[PDB]
């Protein structure tokens, strides 16, 4: 019909994939074994005489995270080929995950992903997940994206990655891997989404009332974002949006693509009983910096074209009235050469709650993907952190010994500097 292929890289990618496919199973009503007690085709294939198999490939260079899926409850859902596990992880090193150990396994995975595309008559794009700080997410992700660019060409390659947090850090070498992967991603990706755990931690504690979250809670909120984005391709609606429609409307330039994400309403069960959750009420909440999934304030920058996706009870009237109200906000800035600024998509399928869920069953919801110059704030912090380490050459020996030539360190530094010039050159009005 019209299907989508998802690939997950690194432990972050596998765990995010675990939550996302959990959401797909209960949203279509598919049991863990693949049976039933519509759009199944878009995400599942009918193979086993009553049985559905998902169109997914999980990749990691170490077996622990994949073996959890192999031994977990959802093990019977996946074909064994779809779960690929390496022998020893990249040790948070970009050089080891790209040249030495990454090339040991690159051509194994590309066979499986090409094999799954043969069954996919209506393939319209790939969804790709990374952890920039991780060795496999960066080094192996770059090698996979470079090959997939020439293998298929004009097929949409969308990314949803975990950018490093502004101050929260778990790996020392995190700045090194992020910049090296930045050069690879910028040229080959059609459009790359960014989120960070630090902004999530604030959101799942303030609006959703959770004192001490884990990675499990963060992954479930990420699953909701992906479900709303793909809801247009999978359910009835009044304004559908395709993969080509987000990409053509959100990116005014080739290298400007990077959007930011937010979701509303995020709210607990007790709070939900007291409020009306009107279309204007949920729309107003998105634009506050507090709801942002990336810890950057839009007021530092400006707004280019935006996308809104509504689910459920929404009526096109209240969308236009709410968006018209948004245009009156002087606290929101738009560049002069984009007076239109919006595309809206409306779908009838409401969000689905989860066993052991974290959210309330809201009858209507909205998700936004928007491009802003405020992301240049994020790139500045990473750039400054890199120079301090590279000025005294703090970790070069690990990377050089595993195949990387030292000349790649300034080259990736130069590409980031050009990218920051691309953002500030565009931001100015004329």
């Amino acid at each position: 019909m019209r299907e989508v292929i998802s690939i997950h890289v690194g432990q972050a990618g596998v765990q995010i994939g675990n939550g996302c496919w959990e959401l797909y199973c209960l949203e279509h009503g598919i049991q863990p074994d693949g049976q039933l007690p519509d759009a199944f085709n878009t995400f599942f294939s009918e193979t086993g005489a009553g049985k559905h198999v998902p169109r997914a490939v999980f990749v990691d260079l170490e077996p622990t995270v994949v073996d959890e899926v192999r031994t977990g409850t959802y093990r019977q859902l996946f074909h064994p080929e779809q779960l690929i596990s390496g022998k020893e992880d990249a040790a948070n090193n970009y050089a080891r995950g790209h040249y030495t150990v990454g090339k040991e396994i690159i051509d194994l995975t590309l066979d499986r992903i090409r094999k799954l595309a043969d069954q996919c008559t209506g393939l319209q794009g790939f969804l790709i997940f990374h952890s920039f700080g991780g060795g496999t997410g960066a080094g192996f992700g770059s090698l996979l994206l470079e090959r997939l660019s020439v293998d298929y060409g004009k097929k949409s390659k969308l990314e949803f990655t975990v950018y490093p947090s502004p101050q929260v850090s778990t790996a020392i070498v995190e700045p090194y891997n992020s910049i090296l992967a930045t050069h690879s991603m910028i040229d080959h990706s059609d459009c790359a989404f960014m989120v960070d755990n630090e902004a999530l931690y604030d959101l799942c504690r303030r609006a959703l009332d959770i004192e001490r979250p884990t990675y499990t809670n963060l992954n479930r909120l990420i699953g909701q974002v992906v479900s709303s984005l793909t809801a247009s391709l999978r359910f009835d609606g009044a304004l559908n949006v395709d993969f080509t429609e987000f990409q053509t409307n959100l990116v005014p330039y080739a290298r400007i693509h990077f959007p930011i994400c937010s979701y509303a309403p995020v709210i607990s069960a007790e709070k939900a009983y007291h409020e009306q959750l009107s279309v204007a009420e949920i729309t107003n909440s998105l634009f506050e910096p507090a709801n942002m999934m990336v810890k950057c304030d839009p007021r530092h920058g400006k707004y280019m074209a935006c996308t809104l996706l509504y689910r459920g009870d929404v009526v096109p009237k209240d969308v236009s009235a709410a968006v018209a109200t948004i245009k009156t906000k002087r606290t929101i800035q738009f560049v002069d050469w984009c007076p239109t600024g919006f595309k809206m998509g409306i779908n009838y399928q409401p969000p689905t709650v989860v066993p052991g869920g974290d959210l309330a069953k809201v009858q209507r919801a909205v998700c936004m993907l928007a491009n802003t110059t405020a992301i240049a704030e994020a790139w500045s912090r990473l750039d400054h952190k890199f120079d301090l380490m590279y000025a005294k050459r703090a970790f070069v020996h690990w990377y050089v010994g595993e195949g990387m030539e030292e000349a790649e360190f300034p080259e990736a530094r130069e590409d980031l500097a050009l990218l920051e010039k691309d953002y500030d050159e565009v931001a100015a009005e004329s």
Partner: protein, 427 residues
């Protein structure tokens, strides 16, 4: 499948090894007869890391025991877990230790070296994979200091890729068991710096300090002293054996904490530690664990961090616990005490989480850090070495073995530069 090969040497290594194998055997649930009698399936998930299976459901560890005199081996045979070890893995000589570095390196080392190396090759090439080797020995002694460094060179020659992480015990500054400690420790430094990827330094004075102050024991025994060391060794490899929210193996640990090849000496510590009467009163949460780890009194090396500065630090946690709460402590403990970290490396504290804590303990943590406080440690041995070396005579027992007097100058030449190497990078 990341098998780890464990090597013990001498009186110090064998006692620590014997106690260490009690901890892991209990953790996985191995009966002293060698048969699994545990309580859960996860213990069998990756028991292959430290155990081999003999036909009959009996598991035997990948252990090698090395000594120059049989006296230490016979005590291990009569120990509680003596039946566990494979009989052919016991390699021993028929001559006294001598407490001499040159004698153990040249005279008795060569004959044992070839017999030992074949024994290692049996276990090294018996498993589907091998991540690295593990060494426990003393530097103040004769057998572990002399022969242990000789085997360390041969392991690197055959297996360059694998991780040669070592656990070492350093001669005590105030009162120690041996007169000729300065020579053996100084001579062993040069071999350790160039060959070993990771070095953990452990001092008996710190262990005694913990037993009084924290554990409130009246008469600390070597059994209690060796227990604390063994719990650190289990913590480092815990990520491989069990799942977790964020895995961190040995190669991850070395990449983060080692910015330059020669700066890889580490200080270690463990939390929580509580006296038997106080554990009723003590609340135990994530912030409580972080308090001990950075507290100077919990360090197992007698080197006060406050006199120096930190370069890198790594902490591991075990048990189900909030990911936010761990990440918040790392940020605060770094911002609160910015006077004790270098400006030119941000995010100096690495983190990791494991799912399953040790028996009895709901949560536990391990700390490995690198600091310039080691300059205190090698200052003490170098100062004592200078006084003894000006007295040319005690070298007499080293020269008869074949050791040239220039080796003492080269031995003093290199670690002096290592002390210098830590001096400049404080700036």
């Amino acid at each position: 499948v990341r098998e780890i090969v464990h090597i013990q040497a001498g009186q110090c290594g064998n006692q620590i090894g014997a106690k260490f194998w009690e901890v892991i055997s209990d953790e996985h649930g191995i009966d002293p007869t060698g048969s699994y009698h545990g309580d859960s399936d996860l213990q069998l998930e990756r028991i292959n890391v430290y155990y081999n299976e003999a036909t009959g459901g009996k598991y035997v560890p990948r252990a090698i025991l090395v000594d120059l005199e049989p006296g230490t081996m016979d005590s291990v045979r009569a120990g509680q877990f003596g039946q566990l070890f494979r009989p052919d893995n016991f390699v021993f000589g028929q001559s006294g230790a001598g407490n001499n570095w040159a004698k153990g390196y040249y005279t008795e080392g060569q004959e044992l070296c070839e017999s030992i190396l074949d024994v290692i090759r049996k276990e090294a090439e018996s498993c589907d994979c091998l991540q690295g080797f593990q060494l426990v020995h003393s530097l103040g002694g004769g057998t572990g200091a002399g022969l242990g460094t000789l085997l360390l060179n041969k392991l690197r020659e055959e297996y360059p890729d694998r991780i040669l992480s070592t656990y070492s015990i350093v001669p005590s500054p105030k009162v120690s068991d041996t007169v000729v400690e300065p020579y053996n420790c100084t001579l062993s430094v040069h071999q350790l710096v160039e060959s070993a990827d990771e070095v953990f330094c452990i001092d008996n004075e710190a262990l005694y300090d913990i037993c009084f102050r924290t554990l409130k024991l009246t008469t600390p025994t070597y059994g209690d002293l060796n227990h604390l060391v063994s719990m650190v060794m289990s913590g480092t490899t815990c990520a491989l054996r069990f799942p977790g929210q964020l895995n961190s193996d040995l190669r991850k640990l070395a990449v983060n904490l080692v910015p330059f090849p020669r700066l890889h000496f580490f200080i270690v510590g463990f939390a929580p530690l509580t006296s038997r009467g106080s554990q009723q009163y003590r609340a135990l949460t994530v912030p409580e664990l972080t308090s001990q780890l950075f507290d100077n009194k919990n360090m197992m090396a007698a080197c006060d961090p406050r006199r120096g500065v930190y370069l890198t630090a790594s902490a591991h946690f075990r048990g189900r616990m909030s990911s936010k709460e761990v990440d918040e402590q790392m940020l605060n403990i770094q911002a609160r005490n910015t006077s004790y970290f270098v400006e030119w490396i941000p995010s100096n504290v690495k983190s990791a989480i494991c799912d399953i804590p040790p028996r009895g303990l709901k949560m536990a943590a391990t700390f490995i850090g690198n600091t310039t406080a080691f300059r205190e440690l090698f200052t003490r041995v170098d100062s004592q070495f200078q006084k003894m070396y000006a007295r040319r005579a005690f070298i007499h027992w080293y020269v008869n073995e074949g050791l040239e007097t220039v080796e003492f100058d080269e031995a003093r030449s290199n670690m002096t530069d290592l002390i210098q190497e830590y001096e400049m990078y404080e700036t």
